[PDB]
Ligand binder design. Structure first.
Ligand SMILES: *[C@@](O)(C(N)=O)[C@@H](C[C@@H]1CCNC1=O)NC(=O)[C@H](CC1CC1)n1cc(F)cc(NC(=O)OC(C)(C)C)c1=O
Ligand SMILES: *[C@](O)(C(N)=O)[C@@H](C[C@@H]1CCNC1=O)NC(=O)[C@H](CC1CC1)n1cc(F)cc(NC(=O)OC(C)(C)C)c1=O
Lengths: 306, 304
């Protein structure tokens, strides 16, 4: 009963957060096995940030320029390389709290939990989604860089995000754990702007299903729609196109409630055209697009992690 | 910048969660030192739950009736006792991952993080407020009982909540860790309902401060109200009265933004009376009341 924006339990990631210092710049690193991953801009001074030559700056560094701290313990750095926009520091000690993990690159619309860290110490956990414009709507201050996003698959932590920067209107950008940016952003102090964001239609439909499961039904109507007619209306409200794959992915949720996906789409179409008329769904006065179909199943069926 | 509903990191609590089974009932327990704490209704069958004579039921239980599992490891139960609605199982092994901890009773309006668990395994985490009517708006399925709510201050875990029940409306009730219910609810199968809830005015103001700090300032106005005049209006909308102590507590946020509390109150008066006119605040079309002043300060200053 009840429906909440809900993050993965973070303990397995907390055990991997360290502090990385290079000169006068401190931020967070991820310690897995005998490697520490962090944003490469830990090697810049403020005066390099406008147009840094990172390859050049890294040559000028030595293993001893990197101070890595896990709690009170300094970890000795015995090697360093750069992959895309992440720095990899080889340390002499493997992290005893390393979980099973992998690195994945997620797609727009997928969700993940963020463990916000400052000086290598976990501060908070929240859920968000990779927006269609490749930003995230996070909560990050100075010091947070190197905070990671992740999912848990049973006992396996999939890391999908590492935090690097803030963009106009207070949204955020970063890389996968191979150091490739999501979207066309670059790690430098330069005017950049995200494109117009859109609403993740498949997620909105998942959340309408969550609403019905939790007993909110008023928006169900007597109509169906074709996929084409649905998209004609949705394009007009800055919604992502709903594809046949999305329809097929919502099928388990449709079986659980007895409401066919295209019947749900006809209800959404009416909500977009007529508005909510002052009314709420699962306590919200707007349509929520940061639960995937899997997040809804997970929450409404209590899938667990260890 | 940015502003999110943010839970505390849950790892210190995860290392304390165990599965407790008694006959056909399994739920979660909290393992601190050599004690496992869990809801006492773990000892009931379905028939028992009409009006359980807890003392009588517990007398008839054996230590051996309690299967406690921590990962792949059974803990041997060597004693049992009851404090109010919580069962304490003494086990022969102290939890090596016991963090520094206290048990606190929180006040309506205050927030905490919930680690929702099933079969002793962490499932997810989220933030709740103790509502003025002594419920929480959680997310809990069968098997969730024994999941805890907590705050972390530095390295100390303050356990404030343990989950026992759902109510009509899809809200939730539970106890502190001494096993006293928040509100007038009881641990038996009986028709129970939450009172009328109210809006946590002081929290709405904290959040409007959060909005300003993050640059969402369209709802600020040049007007000011008196405290009494503010309360005359807001109480009609079923908001809690704002007291001078509330005003005092908002002083840090007021000082940080430079907007006096009674200046901000005129914004809130206008938002209540006229709505948002299709605008949003921090992405919300409704006024949010589950962030405390401290939550805002924590997230907007970045304590760890
Ligand atoms: C569990 O004991 C548990 N094992 O997880 C609780 C879980 C609830 C089930 C779904 N979500 C929950 O929060 N609690 C109960 O089942 C409690 C038991 C407490 C009272 C001793 N409980 C027992 C009942 F007999 C009935 C209810 N609630 C209820 O009927 O609510 C309706 C909304 C369905 C009317 C209850 O919570
Ligand atoms: C970071 O390096 C860290 N140490 O935590 C991180 C933190 C951000 C600051 C405030 N919130 C954050 O998420 N990043 C930066 O400061 C990055 C540097 C990255 C790109 C190389 N950075 C630097 C900078 F000089 C400016 C910005 N952004 C910015 O000014 O945003 C607006 C919206 C004002 C254009 C930036 O992100």
């Amino acid at each position: 009963s009840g429906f909440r924006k809900m993050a993965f339990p973070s303990g397995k990631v907390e055990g991997c957060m360290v502090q990385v210092t290079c000169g006068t710049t401190t931020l967070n690193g991820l310690w897995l096995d005998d490697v520490v991953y962090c944003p490469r801009h830990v090697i810049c001074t403020s005066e390099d940030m406008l147009n840094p030559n990172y390859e050049d700056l890294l040559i000028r560094k030595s293993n001893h320029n990197f101070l890595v701290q896990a709690g009170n313990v300094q970890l000795r750095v015995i090697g360093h390389s750069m992959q895309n926009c992440v720095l990899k520091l080889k340390v002499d000690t493997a992290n005893p709290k390393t979980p099973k993990y992998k690195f994945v690159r997620i797609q727009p619309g997928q969700t993940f939990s963020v463990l916000a860290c400052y000086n290598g110490s976990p501060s908070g956990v929240y859920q968000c989604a990779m927006r269609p414009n490749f930003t995230i709507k996070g909560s990050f201050l100075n010091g947070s860089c190197g905070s990671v996003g992740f999912n848990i698959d049973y006992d396996c932590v999939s890391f999908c995000y590492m935090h690097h920067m803030e963009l106009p209107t207070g949204v955020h950008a970063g890389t996968d754990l191979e150091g490739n940016f999501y979207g066309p952003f670059v790690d430098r102090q330069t005017a950049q702007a995200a494109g117009t964001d859109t609403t993740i239609t498949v997620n909105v439909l998942a959340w309408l299903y969550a609403a019905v499961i939790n007993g909110d039904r008023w928006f169900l109507n007597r109509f169906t729609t074709t996929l084409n007619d649905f998209n004609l209306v949705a394009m007009k409200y800055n919604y992502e196109p709903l594809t046949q794959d999305h329809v097929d992915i919502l099928g388990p949720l449709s079986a659980q409630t007895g409401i066919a996906v295209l019947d749900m789409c006809a209800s959404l179409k009416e909500l977009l055209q007529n508005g909510m008329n002052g009314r709420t769904i699962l306590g919200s006065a707007l349509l929520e697009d940061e639960f995937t179909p899997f997040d809804v199943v997970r929450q409404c069926s209590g899938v667990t992690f260890q």
